[PDB]
Every structure is written in structure tokens, then in C-alpha cells.
Write a protein that binds this ligand. Structure first.
Ligand SMILES: [Mg+2]
Ligand SMILES: [Mg+2]
Ligand SMILES: [Mg+2]
Ligand SMILES: [Mg+2]
Ligand SMILES: [Mg+2]
Ligand SMILES: [Mg+2]
Ligand SMILES: [Mg+2]
Ligand SMILES: [Mg+2]
Ligand SMILES: [Mg+2]
Ligand SMILES: [Mg+2]
Ligand SMILES: [Mg+2]
Ligand SMILES: [Mg+2]
Ligand SMILES: [Mg+2]
Ligand SMILES: [Mg+2]
Ligand SMILES: [Mg+2]
Ligand SMILES: [Mg+2]
Ligand SMILES: [Mg+2]
Ligand SMILES: [Mg+2]
Ligand SMILES: [Mg+2]
Ligand SMILES: [Mg+2]
Ligand SMILES: [Mg+2]
Ligand SMILES: [Mg+2]
Ligand SMILES: [Mg+2]
Ligand SMILES: [Mg+2]
Ligand SMILES: [Mg+2]
Ligand SMILES: [Mg+2]
Ligand SMILES: [Mg+2]
Ligand SMILES: [Zn+2]
Lengths: 64, 71
RNA sequence: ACCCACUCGGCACCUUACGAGAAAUCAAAGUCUUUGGGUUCUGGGGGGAGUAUGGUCGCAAGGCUGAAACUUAAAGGAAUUGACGGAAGGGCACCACCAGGAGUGGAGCCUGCGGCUUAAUUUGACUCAACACGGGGAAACUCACCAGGUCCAGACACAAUAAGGAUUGACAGAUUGAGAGCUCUUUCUUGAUUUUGUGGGUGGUGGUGCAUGGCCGUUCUUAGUUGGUGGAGUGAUUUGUCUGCUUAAUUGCGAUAACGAACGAGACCUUAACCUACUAAAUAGUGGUGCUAGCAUUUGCUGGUUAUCCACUUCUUAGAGGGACUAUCGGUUUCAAGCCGAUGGAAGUUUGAGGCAAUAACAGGUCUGUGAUGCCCUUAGACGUUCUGGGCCGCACGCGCGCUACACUGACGGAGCCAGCGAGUCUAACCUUGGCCGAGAGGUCUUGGUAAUCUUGUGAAACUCCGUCGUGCUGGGGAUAGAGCAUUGUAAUUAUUGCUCUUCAACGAGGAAUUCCUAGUAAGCGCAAGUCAUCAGCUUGCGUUGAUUACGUCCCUGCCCUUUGUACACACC
């Protein structure tokens, strides 16, 4: 499916003196910018980075 | 392929004849002009066009064919 | 005799390699541009050629010594990557086998192919990967073929003719298949729009698919491709990308000079499965209510009523969510990836089935889908085009896909009565309910539907039930043929199709061979859609009934992978 989503294709028959050629172009657009749709490959699996902890500190409680 | 055969005799075309035509029109000794060949009473042909003279036939040519006026 | 340590001198193997080499490799092939211990011999591009010649040795065969002319841009070595092999080792698959199923192969006809025949019987394609294929079911059309008849729709440019008419057209007759002014007779008409000529265009289902684009098929029911940092090599390269194990998978575990990644696989998407949870629906349906019919009556039972009202979303519809991750547990396994069993579960074979699909290859197919196209051919007695008619269907026979059968798990006649995927008419005649008429095919009057609203609950077929027949080529089978009736169409003859009567063939389960297939699958069965004016024995899908047998292997066949050889690299054609 991402094919449908992400790559533009095109063929064009260029016609010259000796015969004709096929041009075939493929653009793959950055899925990050997708604007309207999926923002990454179904492949993509980011892990969010934790956070160093400064734990311990014997109990205690705050009042408000 | 094959090329050519024929029992001879090719076809031609048409000529449109020659004729320095419209002398048909008699004008007398200065200068009254009387018409030969009677003209056409079909409003599509303002009596300028004429009738050819065959047998039984008097026929309107401008009317590309149409109508059989017989006198 | 043996053992253990040393020591000379042997035949060798091992590992390293400071070092050497173009490399393979080498304790010498090392101590060489940091070039010298002593000495012998041979080579100086390839072929010509160890040829000619002279000498010499020999019984001989022949040995030793041994040129040139001329030709030629490479021959050659070692290593690499491929490609190939009629070498070797591992795999993988119902287009392979096993265990089986249902068959094709035999018959009749249907249909394609060859062949023959022909005025022509248009043509592409010939192992899997040509042959119910070109969506190829051709009556005209299509149409390319054959027998004939018209027309230019010959742009434009120059020239020529020429307003005293460049050219156009035609009534009747002749002619013609023809109510073609095709052509001729005849004599009007037309007005610079043509016509003749050269140059240049144009059309062409004409050639070339071995000149091309594009598309498609095949390799491929496959699992392969690449780069970053590191390791090896002067280099092309290599390692990563591997013995094994595992998986449908270069899918993973694991091993590990590699670490960690990307394309392809997976993910992804689509459809079939599950939601008494969410949003709703007179174009979907349920319960209650009236209005009302039939049977029982004691309340009951079974129906009618596109709105007489109220309510609801279980069923139908489609939005948004949720759901499964091979979960739990246990066996098995390098206790790894996994695999197997049980419980649960809508679902636990990639959940079932598809869509998508990397790098590369083929002189695969298609110029006959294209106003895609190079070049060649042709262009007015046309290979342009159109009109009339025939042909593609022609029938001693060979091949292939199919249909229907050989009956008693059946044919027949009543009677039961149940699907899903579709599709339908505007500037038009598509899908057709209902009423009559007709034995039937059909006809006729109306009608609803641009559609979840109407056809249509598509009341489809196998199938189920009660009878008849009773094993007899029989009431199995329905080829071939006669006569009649209707439908489509301008046209039905060589019989478009449909109906009725009669005629009643072969075929008594099919040799050698050979196809397809593992669960709602096989097989039996009908339907819708494509085609389509008319015609399905084809196809694409659909649902209905619903098994037997594997849950394995490498024997056959096919192909992948290593290893190995190569003098191939335009790569064994
Ligand atoms: Mg078997
Ligand atoms: Mg058999
Ligand atoms: Mg047929
Ligand atoms: Mg050819
Ligand atoms: Mg014709
Ligand atoms: Mg010309
Ligand atoms: Mg010319
Ligand atoms: Mg063409
Ligand atoms: Mg080709
Ligand atoms: Mg091609
Ligand atoms: Mg299979
Ligand atoms: Mg280096
Ligand atoms: Mg490898
Ligand atoms: Mg619901
Ligand atoms: Mg269970
Ligand atoms: Mg070829
Ligand atoms: Mg083409
Ligand atoms: Mg044919
Ligand atoms: Mg076939
Ligand atoms: Mg019956
Ligand atoms: Mg009658
Ligand atoms: Mg209406
Ligand atoms: Mg019989
Ligand atoms: Mg019968
Ligand atoms: Mg049809
Ligand atoms: Mg067909
Ligand atoms: Mg090699
Ligand atoms: Zn007139």
C-alpha cells in the first residue's frame, strides 16, 4: 500500500529521428511531511527515550 | 503478395465537352434579342437557366436533375 | 626388543612468515633499485617451425646441430566475477511423487490446431511458457481473404490550362448486382471552390516484434539485491551474505572478523469470519398497537393492512472502534528460534483468499488495441476507402480444451421448496412484475424501476418426498434426419436461436498413456456478469449439496543451492 501513498510514477514516449524512447520517472516523497495521511512507513517503530531517574530519598510528604 | 492481372480495358473519366456555347440567343437587326431554348419555372432557378433539347425531353440542368417539363 | 633426552646425516609432513612473488604459492622461489660469494646452461612477442638448408650419427626409424622470406596485434600467465556441464553433496512443490479422489485418453457432438480442399477458405502463436488463446461466440458490419463496382477524403508549394469557361453535377436511355451520370448517347448546368504536371504530403489490420516505446508472459508455487564502519587482497574482489538448526521466506536462532542497516520477504492494503458495546435507518427489519380474515374458541393459532400510530437496532445496511499476539498450560528441541498436543476462543494451516511486489534475464508475445513508432513497401487499373456478394463454418483424416452419456446412489411423472455474486431506459426503447390469448415457443394490453425503493425473496439446480418403469442397448442414451410453428435482424439458404411431432445412431466404464487436487477444498449442481440485435457446449465470479485420502518423502519429474571444471564472457543457440 505505501506505494499508492508515497511514490509518484510516470511514463512518456519521446519520439526521435531513429525510433522512440521510454522515459520512466519515480519520485518518493518524504513521508514525514505527509500532511494528509500516514506520517511514516508502516515499517516505522520509534521508541520514546526514557529519562534518567534520581530516585531514593526516604519517603516524606508535601502539604497544600 | 501477388501483383497484377487484368483482362485489359481500363476506365476513363469525363470531359465536360468543349463548346463556346451561349450563342443560343438570337438578336435581330438592331437589336431586339429573342431567346432560344425555353427557361425554367422552378423558383430555385430564376428563369436564367435553360432547358436542354432531347426527345420528349426538355430538361432543367441547374435543377441538378429535378423535374420534367415536356413541350 | 622397547622407552626417554640429545646429536649428526636422510625421505617428508605441519604451523607461521621477518621475507619473496603478477599471483597460485615459496624455508627457498628468502637474505634484489639498501641491486655483486663461486660457477654452468638456456630465453628475448606470436606464427612461420624444430620447417628449409649444410654438416654429422644411425641398418632403419630417426637423433644432434638448425636458419630466412613472409605473415601478425596479440598469443600467453596467475587470480576474480559470472555463465554453462552428459561431476559431486544438499534441498524445495500435488503445474513432483506417496495415500487417494474426480477424471481426460475410448464414443457422439461442441470448439480451437494441423492437414487437405478452395476464387478465397484473412492472420498471429507450436514444450511447461502455442492449440474455449489474440477477451477470436465472424450471417451484413466486424474483415485483414476472394469475385467485382464507386469515391479522394491526392494538405500545402511552383508550374500549366483557363473567364470566349479551370472545373462541377444530372433527368431518361444504354449500361449495371444495383433507383452508381461507373461509363456512353444527348445538352443543360456549375464558376475559379477544381483539373493536368512535378515536388511534397497523406492514409494503410502492407512488411519488419530480429529496428523500437509501451504492455504482457516466463524465470518466479522463487528468495534474492545493496551500501556504511571494520577485517583480507597490489588489484578485479572478498568478508558481512556462514557448518548447523529453523521458516512459506537472506524467516530467524545460532556459529562468527565482523558490527550494525536498507531494497525485496514481512509489514501494508482488499475481501470473507466475530461484537445484544457506539452512532442510525418508511429505499433494511423486529416486537406492541389499532383496522381486519380463517380455524378454534378459555386466553390461543395463522395470515392481510409502504405509514393508522408508539417503541426498539437482535437479525440487514456501513461509519467509528474493539479483537489475536500462534494467548494459557504442557510436551519436544543445542531447553535457542521453533515445532507438536491440550484448554479457551469468532477465529490459532502467513487466520482463509486475494492485491502489491526488489535487482536482473528472453532477440518470449503484441507494429492486428492505439492519431504510440523508426525504416521498407504502396498510394488512383490503390495495399487508401467504400458499396454489392462469397469466405473465415469449407471435409478421406492426425492433435488439443470441453459438453453429454453408458443408467436402478437411475430415468421419468407428480409434489416439496432453498442461494449468493451481478445488471438494468435520455434525449430512449434497458431490466420487466401483473391481466388476458396460445399446447409450446411466443403474442397482446398495461405497469414499477436511472434502482437496498421495481424486475427480485431473482420460489436457480443438484436435492427432498409419493408414484411409474424393472434390467432388457430399456421408459438409459439423444447423434443424425424429415415435416410444421414462432423470435432477432435490412437479410437466416450453407439450416442464428427458441417450440412440437416423428426419426432413436455411437456409447455396456474406456489400451499405451496423461491432467487436477488437501476443507467448506475435491467433485456434483445451477446462477449472474463479459461477449450480445440474435447465438455459450467459453470465460470471470457466485452460492447451493458436500466426501474419500496425505499432514509424509526425494522414487519419478521440475527447479533452486553449494561444491567443482572450463580454453566459454555475443557466455554451450
Ligand atoms: Mg498416487
Ligand atoms: Mg484413471
Ligand atoms: Mg458453437
Ligand atoms: Mg512473424
Ligand atoms: Mg463486405
Ligand atoms: Mg501529386
Ligand atoms: Mg512523387
Ligand atoms: Mg496504423
Ligand atoms: Mg521480443
Ligand atoms: Mg517488447
Ligand atoms: Mg501448493
Ligand atoms: Mg586496504
Ligand atoms: Mg554467498
Ligand atoms: Mg447490529
Ligand atoms: Mg476447541
Ligand atoms: Mg523471436
Ligand atoms: Mg502494440
Ligand atoms: Mg475462425
Ligand atoms: Mg487451455
Ligand atoms: Mg425428479
Ligand atoms: Mg394455437
Ligand atoms: Mg415510468
Ligand atoms: Mg432407448
Ligand atoms: Mg431420454
Ligand atoms: Mg448472456
Ligand atoms: Mg472466447
Ligand atoms: Mg572459477
Ligand atoms: Zn430548374
Amino acid at each position: 500500500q505505501p506505494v499508492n501513498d508515497f511514490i509518484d510514477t510516470a511514463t512518456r514516449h519521446v519520439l526521435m529521428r531513429q525510433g522512440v524512447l521510454g522515459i520512466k520517472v519515480k519520485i518518493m516523497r518524504d513521508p514525514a511531511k505527509s500532511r494528509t495521511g500516514p506520517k511514516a512507513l508502516p515499517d516505522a517503530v520509534t521508541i520514546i527515550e526514557p529519562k534518567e531517574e534520581e530516585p531514593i530519598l526516604a519517603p516524606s510528604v508535601k502539604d497544600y | 503478395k501477388k501483383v497484377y492481372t487484368t483482362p485489359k480495358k481500363i476506365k476513363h473519366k469525363h470531359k465536360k465537352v468543349k463548346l463556346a456555347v451561349l450563342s443560343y440567343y438570337k438578336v435581330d437587326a438592331e437589336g431586339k434579342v429573342t431567346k432560344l431554348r425555353r427557361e425554367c419555372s422552378n423558383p430555385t432557378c430564376g428563369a436564367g437557366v435553360f432547358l436542354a433539347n432531347h426527345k420528349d425531353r426538355l430538361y432543367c440542368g441547374k435543377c441538378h436533375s429535378v423535374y420534367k417539363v415536356n413541350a
